[PDB]
Each structure stands twice: as structure tokens, then as C-alpha cells.
Design a protein around this nucleic acid. Structure first.
Lengths: 51, 119, 74, 96, 50
RNA sequence: CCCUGGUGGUUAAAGAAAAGAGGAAACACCUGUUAUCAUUCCGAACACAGAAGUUAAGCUCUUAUUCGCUGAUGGUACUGCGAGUUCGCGGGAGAGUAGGUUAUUGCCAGGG
RNA sequence: GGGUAGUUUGACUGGGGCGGUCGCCUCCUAAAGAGUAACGGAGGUGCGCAAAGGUUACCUUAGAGUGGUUGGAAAUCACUCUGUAAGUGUAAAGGCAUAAGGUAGCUUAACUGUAAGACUGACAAGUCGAACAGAUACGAAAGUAGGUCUUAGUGAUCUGGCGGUGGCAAGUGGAAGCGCCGUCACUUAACGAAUAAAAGGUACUCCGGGGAUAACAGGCUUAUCCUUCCCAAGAGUUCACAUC
RNA sequence: CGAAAUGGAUUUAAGUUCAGCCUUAUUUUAGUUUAAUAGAGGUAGAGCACUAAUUGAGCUAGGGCCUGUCAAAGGGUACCAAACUCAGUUAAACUCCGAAUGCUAUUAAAUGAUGAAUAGGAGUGAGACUAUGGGCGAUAAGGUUCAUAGUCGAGAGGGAAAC
């Protein structure tokens, strides 16, 4: 009941990070302030698919 | 009895944790500690490489004749800054010494800050 | 009726790596341990798994205070 | 029967042979030791003076050793340090 | 002899300088030599050099 | 220098309980919640505003060692080694017992 | 579709087979560095958590005794003694009063490029790490934060898929495809994995070898078996030993 | 000049590979044994403060029985017994304490190619016994499997009648 999700930089769309998240516990759309190395600046990353 | 004893014990535990969180003071950047009695207000600057009080101040000092209010500790911090500058120390580490950084301590610290002391 | 058990992990090689009085340089590992069997004194640091390491060159020393052992670099 | 080392480790990529631009290195120290002023250091003279072999015809000039003699160059590539030193000594450079 | 004795004691005797039976060596008694002699007292004969 | 308060070093209970002594200064208790603050409720703690009062408590000093802690000298257990064998040499407990222990000290401020 | 052909069907094992087991973690065995076997003796495990993470600030149980509507031995509250035996997602050990325990606020460092110097180690691997640059989070600041108190929660290479970058482009220019960066899909659990794809019998058997390995005997031991002995509560009318 | 029968891994267990061990050559110079001094243990032992086992007394809840007992409020306690006190014991997976050795660092002596690095070339990866510390077995086995040292292995000679 745990899936591998990918955190995507909002303003570039690059899949910068991958992480684990438990489905059937929140089924929300996890957002995380992560550092986007393309921009040398922190920004918002959203949950998304892997494949 | 036990209640006063446990209040003391809690104060000591807080003091000890604060001390090893901030670390020890060195002659370049010594440590400023405070003590808040029911009547007065004390501050000491300590170099732990020697265990020596480089400078100190308190409201007992008659010449200052300050009170025990925010205003008074503002002026007292001003006096402490001018006393330390002539001994050319500008970096200090602020040991809140078992108190909560708020009110009187906040005003004291900010007063040391507006006059070129790095705390 | 065979044996219900017989299962052992790999030995982790803990213990003191540099003996008291030895000369170490910066970054040396001094103790490997689970938990603060030895606590940190002057000029040493503690890793995330309670490893003891030397922040500067010097000579290792162990002290005892209230029954707890402290490691330092002097 | 243990998996060999060349099968535990991974690979890294192609070799890019069949598309290399391969060609001879000649150094400033060599030119200083072998030549003199005024002639054209080029394919023909380096070949006859035995600094390269006439299999390769795309020489590059590198900057080991020091060069003191004003010369003319007709080469295919040149390092920045070497052409700076050679212009400073006062030679001339044509890239062919 | 050195045959069959303990490894530590063979090392001590070779550190004193004796390899065979009938070996003769003069040594100046300080703490080190005294400790070695005490270790290997049962295999040596000590005479004194006037 | 000393008393008190604050701050370091030296780690052996530098421990708690019971009884007595004081309180000038200092410290603490104590006053009010109304100002910023805190409480999974409660000026209790903390926070802020002040000095009417006190040794009752905390604290300091003096106490029988009442509880704890520490600890001899010997002896024993155990141990290294030995062509001495229940021995020869070297090292030597724990426990118990005779005892001991309610610290000491560097430097900042107030004034005796 | 055994009509027919080519092959597979493991090893450890106090012979073999049956049975059981194969990764990793905790303790003892382990003889006071480390290391150290067994089909030795005991447990857990192929996760969970967007908080049970990070930071700041503020706090301490369990048990005994006593007093209280339900409330009794025990639910909640007050106090005395006790001072961590309580509690630390999950096994156990080592640790945790400055609490790593508990509560509350803010927040995403559950970062990027990196790294002096090391431990452990056949190798391949694994682990700690001051400090530097960028971007932050928290705090007044010093500082802390490169997940979880630490120690298990895991799987190489090859192949394939997705995204980004735009290096390679077989005359040239495009393109296919590939390299590079990010990353997914193996109870490959026989867990350093021989194939992408695999069960039995041979007492009709055969070959190459082994006392490195069983069955009949030799040798060792005596659990077992057998033959004695030591003590005598009793039986034997009374009389331990006529006898048992 | 001079081994190994060890460790790691393996469709491995009679194989093979890496390390360790050995040799040749070059380069390099500090093994190892003490003494002094300075370090970390939990082993033997010891012990009951902690986790457990457990003996005789003192003391005492609670439960049962009996007794003017309705199943209310009462008493006697021959007992079953928590907790507590005194005394005396058990523990590889209990330790309030803790050696002797060993391990590690420094210095001074002592011993003379025993160390380390590189290059070339192997072999070994079946051990056995004795003196000790062990586990398993039955404080049985020339038994099995570990740790220290020696011997044989690869060692002639003397002695233990042969061995």
C-alpha cells in the first residue's frame, strides 16, 4: 500500500526527486518545497507518476 | 519543600542544556550570561578558557541608578556596550541562563545589538 | 526432530580503535559503538551512529566523571 | 563459480573508433631542439626531419619545452598556450 | 634447548641473543635484562663477571 | 581580605532526612494581573509591574553518622610462569572488618 | 502432439535418503582488543511513519503508602516515600536526566555540487566524517538540520520502459538509434543470483573413484544390557541381615 | 631459502579463485621481545543493588475453612500466602564491584636482515595429537567442532620394554 512517487519541479517540469508515499492514507496531492538544481533555487514540487 | 526543590531542579536542567547547546566562550567571542533576581538584574561576560569575568554590570550599581524595567535595562545595555567597546570585544554568545528570551531579556539583547555588538 | 534455531549475525567489530595516549590526526575514528558507551569530551564529535571521531590532531585521552567515560583530544 | 569481476561491474559506453580524428603531437621543445629560424614548420619539413611519420597528416602542436626561434607554421591545430607563447616569441601561425 | 618451548619464551631468548645450548653472552643488568632473565630463568645459567 | 550573590575548574555522596543558630547587605519567600507573554484548564510555573512583611521555607553555618557513600592492613578466591607439584616465583581481589566522609578552589560585583 | 528427439530436476547433512535449513539483525556460547565453529541455546525481520521528520520552546514517569460518587487490588485526581525499575512505531542489546521521554508553535535539510581524513575489509562492497559553495527551514543569535536514538526492513550485471539534456549521426543535411543525467520493472527467498524458459525411476543398469562415506566383522567408549557390591526401612509370630 | 591443511566466495563440499603463508630480484628501514609510564574490559572470581531462581524464622495483606456465621456489619487463624525484616544460597544469555594475563601507545636498552613496498613464479584451501580454556555427547569415546602453544606433518638421534 506504499507507492514510489516522483516530485516534479513546478516551473520546469523536471522530475527532480523520487520518494515513497503511502496510498490509502491521504490520497491527497503532496507538495514539498524542494531545491530545484536547474534554477539554483528552492521551489514547489508536486507528486506525480513514475511510469 | 519538594515543590520549591523541583522548581530549582528544573531551572538547573534548563541551564545545563542551554550551556552545552551554545558551547563555551573564547577570548575572541566570550559568553554573556544574565541573572534576574526579585530586585535586580545582573550580566557577566566570561572567557571560559580562563574562567575570567572580562566585564560585568547590574542595577545595584548606584551611579547608574536605573530601575528594573524595560527602559532601565535598555539604558543598562547601552552602558554595557560602551564599557565593552573600550575593551574591544564585539562578538558575544548569548547565554540566556535558564530564562526565556522575552521581555526584559529581549530588550537587553536588542539594546546590545543597536550599538555594534554581535550576539 | 531437528534444531529449531541456529542463526547468528555478522560480527560488527566494535570497540576502541585508538588507545588512550595515541596520537591521531583530524577525522580519525576512535570508538565504534551502539550508544554512548563513551561520551564526547573536548575536541571530539559524535556521528549519527554514536561513533567517536577527532576534530583535530592531538593525543587521545579518557577521563571518568561520576562513573561515565569521556573521550577527548589533548 | 563466483560471478567474475568483469561481470559484476557495469559497462560505460562506446569506443567511438571509426570516427576519431587521430593525428600526431609535436611539442615546442622538440621544434626548438630540431629547427632554426625562417623555415616553414609543416608536414613536409617535420616528415623529412623525422618528427612525425607520413602516415598522419593532421599535426597538432603542444607546449612542452620552450621555443626561442622565430618560425612559420602551417599546421592543423594548436593549443592556446602554445600559440600564445609562439606569438609572443614572434612567429606566425596559419591553420590548415 | 629452544625446541618445544613456548613461542613467547623462544622470542625472549632470541632477544637475549642465545640461539643454541652452550651460548655465551655478557649483559649489563638493568630493568629490561632483569625482566627477560626472570621470564626465562629456568633455561639459563647466570655467572657473574668480576 | 571576608559575608552574600553570580560564574569556572578540580569528580571521593560535592547525597538526602532530623535538630539548632541568622536575614545588615545580598538572596529567597512574599503583592497585584492591567500593559507584552505562557498554560492541551490554572499569575502554580513562567511573564510583567513593586518593596508592606518575614526566617517559616529555599539558602548558609553548626550537629549525633541516624540513612547512604567511600574504604584499610592482612587473609582467601583467582591468575602468569616454572625439570621444587597441592608445591617454587610474580601479581592480587570482591566481600567482610578497624575506619573515614555533610568538599575544595580560580576570579567578577555590592560592603564591611 | 512422450509418436519422437535433445536436456534439467541443487547443496549442507556426524553415510545417504526423509525431515529441516539457506538473506539480514539482537544476545549468549566467545576464554575481559578485535576476530573465532556447530544440525549450539534463545528472538525478530523482506516494514511503518508527510510525522512517528527537521528546528525552537516548555515539561517528566512506573511502583509502594494515604485520602476521594460510580471506582472494586487496579480507571481519574491530590500528597508522602522511591529517583528511571516508566517510556523510547517495530525484535533484542547497547544507550537515553542536558533526557534520544512528553507537549506545543513554525516548517520541509526526507536538499544540490562536493569533500580533508578513516574504520571494517580477499575482492567487489559497506559505514563515519570536520569542513567548502549554492539554496533554504527554524531560532533574536550563536548554531542545528544531507530523514527516522543507534544497530535488520533487502538484490549485482545484462536487457527493456519513462523523463530531461543534445554528445555520437557510416557522402552531406534530417531522422532512427545510442551515450550521458534522473529513474522504474526479478520470492533471481538456492537471496555474490550458471538459462528468458525444466519433474521422476533404474532391483536390467553401466563407467570413472573413494574406507574422504553406509551395511557384516576389527578397534574405542559403555548410554543400554548383564553380573556384583555398599546403606537397611521392613516383611519374615517377636527376630534389619535364615531368606527376601 | 623454505610452506599450507586458515579466512572469504562459489550448482561450492574430492574442484577452482582471492587473501594469508613461501621463494627470487630491486628499493626501503623498524618487526619482535621486555622495563617504565599512560589506556579501554566484564572473563575467572565475587556478589544480590537490577532482572530471575530459592531455604529456615519474624511479620502480614488477601483467599479458604471453622466459630454467636441467612449472601449485612463480626472473630479464632492448624493453613493456601503477596509485600516487608533477619540469616543463609543459584544463574553463559542477572552484575552494585572486579582481577591476573592479553591487547594498544610512547621512551630507553637489547637482539642483527626477523619488517614493509614493487615486480616475477608457485604450492596449499582434507589436518592430526598433546598441554590448557570450551561447546555438543553421557563433566563416555583415538568422537565432533572452536581458542593459545608445541610436536608430527616436513625431523634424524637418546629415553618412555615394542610404540
Amino acid at each position: 500500500a506504499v507507492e514510489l512517487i516522483s516530485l516534479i519541479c513546478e516551473e520546469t517540469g523536471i522530475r527532480n526527486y523520487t520518494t515513497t508515499k503511502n496510498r490509502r492514507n491521504k490520497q491527497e496531492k503532496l507538495e514539498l518545497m524542494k531545491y530545484c538544481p536547474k534554477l539554483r533555487k528552492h521551489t514547489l514540487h508536486k507528486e506525480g507518476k513514475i511510469k | 519543600m519538594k515543590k520549591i526543590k523541583e522548581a530549582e531542579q528544573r531551572k538547573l536542567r534548563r541551564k545545563k542544556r542551554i550551556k552545552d547547546k551554545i558551547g563555551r566562550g573564547v577570548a575572541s567571542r566570550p559568553r554573556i550570561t544574565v541573572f534576574k533576581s526579585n530586585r535586580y538584574f545582573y550580566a557577566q561576560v566570561i572567557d571560559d578558557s580562563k574562567g575570567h569575568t572580562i566585564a560585568s554590570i547590574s542595577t545595584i550599581e548606584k551611579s547608574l541608578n536605573l530601575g528594573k524595567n524595560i527602559d532601565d535595562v535598555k539604558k543598562l545595555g547601552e552602558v554595557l556596550a560602551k564599557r565593552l567597546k573600550e575593551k574591544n570585544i564585539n562578538n558575544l554568545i548569548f547565554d540566556r541562563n535558564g530564562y526565556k528570551y522575552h521581555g526584559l531579556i529581549a530588550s537587553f539583547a536588542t539594546s546590545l545589538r543597536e550599538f555594534g555588538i554581535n550576539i | 526432530g531437528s534444531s529449531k534455531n541456529g542463526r547468528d549475525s555478522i560480527s560488527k567489530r566494535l570497540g576502541v580503535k585508538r588507545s588512550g595516549g595515541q596520537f591521531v590526526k583530524a577525522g580519525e575514528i576512535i570508538v565504534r559503538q551502539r550508544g554512548t558507551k563513551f561520551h564526547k569530551g573536548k575536541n571530539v564529535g559524535l556521528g549519527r551512529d554514536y561513533t567517536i571521531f577527532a576534530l583535530s590532531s592531538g593525543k587521545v585521552e579518557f577521563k571518568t566523571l561520576k562513573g561515565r567515560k569521556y573521550v577527548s583530544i589533548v | 563459480g563466483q560471478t567474475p569481476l568483469y561481470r559484476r561491474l557495469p559497462r560505460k559506453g562506446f569506443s567511438n573508433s571509426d570516427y576519431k580524428l587521430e593525428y600526431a603531437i609535436v611539442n615546442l621543445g622538440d621544434i626548438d631542439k630540431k629547427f632554426k629560424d625562417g623555415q616553414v614548420v609543416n608536414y613536409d619539413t617535420l616528415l623529412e626531419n623525422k618528427l612525425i611519420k607520413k602516415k598522419n597528416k593532421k599535426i597538432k602542436i603542444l607546449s612542452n619545452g620552450k621555443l626561442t626561434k622565430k618560425v612559420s607554421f602551417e599546421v592543423s591545430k594548436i593549443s592556446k598556450s602554445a600559440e600564445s607563447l609562439v606569438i609572443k616569441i614572434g612567429c606566425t601561425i596559419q591553420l590548415v | 634447548s629452544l625446541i618445544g618451548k613456548l613461542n613467547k619464551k623462544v622470542k625472549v631468548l632470541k632477544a637475549l641473543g642465545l640461539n643454541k645450548i652452550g651460548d655465551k653472552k655478557v649483559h649489563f643488568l638493568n630493568e629490561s635484562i632483569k625482566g627477560m632473565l626472570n621470564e626465562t630463568i629456568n633455561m639459563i645459567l647466570l655467572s657473574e663477571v668480576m
